[PDB]
């Protein structure tokens, strides 16, 4: 998810935030009208810190939203991991069975992504999700297709 992002959209979003506040450098310096550069620099730094923290928490929330779809498939259902480990511990073999089809994980991914609002809210997240989506769908198909025999 993080790797998908790009600089231009992030800069555009930061500029949009500044414009929405109306707190542009020229207006702020014209407002204060003093040469105490350290104070204005600290004010700007704290503004950017607020924006950065909000972005961090937003992205964390979305990322946790994505992870929940895959996690339940690992421990149980097709491709269960403890079954693999006990297969290894008993014989060293691991019989597998395969069919290509779309199942629960792909449906969950499809439902989650098309509804989520952060895609509309942030262009950066929109592009990142659009780029990362296909890989998520391939990985979900990988989860759903394979089964470890009983």
């Amino acid at each position: 998810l993080l790797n998908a992002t790009t600089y231009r959209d992030l800069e555009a979003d930061w500029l949009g935030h500044v414009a929405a506040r109306g707190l542009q450098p020229q207006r702020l310096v014209r407002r204060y009208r003093n040469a105490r550069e350290a104070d204005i620099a600290g004010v700007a730094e704290r503004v950017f810190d607020t924006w950065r923290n909000t972005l961090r928490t937003t992205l964390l929330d979305f990322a946790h939203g994505l992870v929940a779809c895959f996690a339940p498939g690992g421990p149980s259902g097709p491709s269960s991991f403890p079954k693999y480990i006990d297969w290894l511990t008993c014989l060293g073999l691991v019989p597998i069975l395969r069919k290509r089809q779309e199942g629960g994980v792909t449906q969950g991914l499809r439902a989650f992504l098309k509804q989520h609002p952060l895609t509309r809210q942030l262009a950066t997240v929109a592009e990142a999700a659009e780029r990362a989506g296909p890989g998520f769908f391939e990985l979900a198909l990988a989860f759903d297709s394979t089964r470890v025999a009983d």
């Binding site: 979003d13 949009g16 935030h17 929405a20 506040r21 109306g22 924006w51 909000t54 972005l55 928490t57 937003t58 929330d61 952060l118 809210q121 942030l122």
Partner: peptide
């Protein structure tokens, strides 16, 4: 104004 994670 606007913020990146608000409704």
């Amino acid at each position: 104004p606007y913020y990146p994670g608000e409704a």
